[PDB]
């Protein structure tokens, strides 16, 4: 199926406490593979997945030049945007940037992305045409004119349609053993009386990869979506994910309810009953 690669950058001002905190992370699909931390010793882009470890110094040197240049650009931008918004020097603010590309099962480019935030809200974004920008507010309009004059979109598009997809294909091949696996969920049910007349049924999915999954409850074959408590899909810490779904049922009627689990790893959707 399809795959993604994304870079996420966070810069946070800390007035009177030195230079802003800068953190970079890179992912392929749901697997993190690199990091940079302005506050760490090494001052290099570092590996965080085993399959990237094999890249040589020519890679790590260019990646370090890149993340350093991003961190310096973002540090100056924190000053600029404080100015655009007429904010005092005393408060802490945050720039976030995401960019990356999606590829289809044939490895071909599907979509590219570049979007930036200020204090957790949209600031400026590259449109799907990879040619024009959408500015969230008047500050971002100032940035937009600047970026239109510097032909910023053409540079981003060049990366998104080229290097981004090329290296995504390289990683999918070199980390094939983990990136291209499907680990189907391991499923079970739990059951807890709440009173004499109600009980909880909880349907578990564990140990699955990728993160995308669907868990649904039915009663006599009918969807119970609005009566289902879900938790957000969460990391197990070993590179797999977890989720559960629960319903409250009349004691004695458990057998009318079925849990349905759909995942890429499964030959067939699973059905569970108590």
């Amino acid at each position: 199926g399809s795959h993604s690669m994304r870079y996420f950058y966070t810069s946070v001002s800390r007035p009177g406490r030195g230079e802003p905190r800068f953190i970079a992370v890179g992912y392929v699909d749901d697997t993190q593979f690199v990091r940079f931390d302005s506050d760490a010793a090494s001052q290099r882009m570092e590996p965080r997945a085993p399959w990237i470890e094999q890249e040589g110094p020519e890679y790590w040197d260019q990646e370090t030049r890149n993340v350093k240049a991003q961190s310096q650009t973002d540090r100056v931008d924190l000053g600029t945007l404080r100015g655009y918004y007429n904010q005092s020097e005393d408060g802490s603010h945050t720039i976030q940037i995401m960019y990356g590309c999606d590829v289809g099962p044939d490895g071909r480019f599907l979509r590219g992305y570049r979007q930036d935030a200020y204090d957790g809200k949209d600031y400026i974004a590259l449109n799907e045409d990879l040619r024009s920008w959408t500015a969230a507010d008047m500050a971002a309009q100032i940035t937009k004119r600047k970026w239109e004059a510097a032909h910023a979109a053409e540079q981003q598009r060049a990366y998104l349609e080229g290097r981004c997809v090329e290296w995504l294909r390289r990683y999918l091949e070199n980390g094939k053993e983990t990136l291209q696996r499907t680990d189907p969920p391991k499923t079970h049910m739990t059951h807890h009386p709440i009173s004499d007349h109600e009980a909880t049924l909880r349907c578990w999915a564990l140990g699955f990869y990728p993160a995308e999954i669907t868990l649904t409850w039915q009663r006599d074959g009918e969807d119970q979506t609005q009566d289902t408590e879900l938790v957000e899909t969460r990391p197990a810490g070993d590179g797999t994910f977890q989720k559960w779904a629960a319903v409250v049922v009349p004691s004695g009627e458990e057998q009318r309810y079925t849990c349905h689990v759909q995942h890429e790893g499964l030959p067939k959707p699973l059905t569970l009953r108590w």
Partner: peptide, 10 residues
């Protein structure tokens, strides 16, 4: 791989 030319001042 990340982008070498993309950063431009806001």
């Amino acid at each position: 791989s990340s982008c070498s030319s993309c950063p431009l001042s806001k």
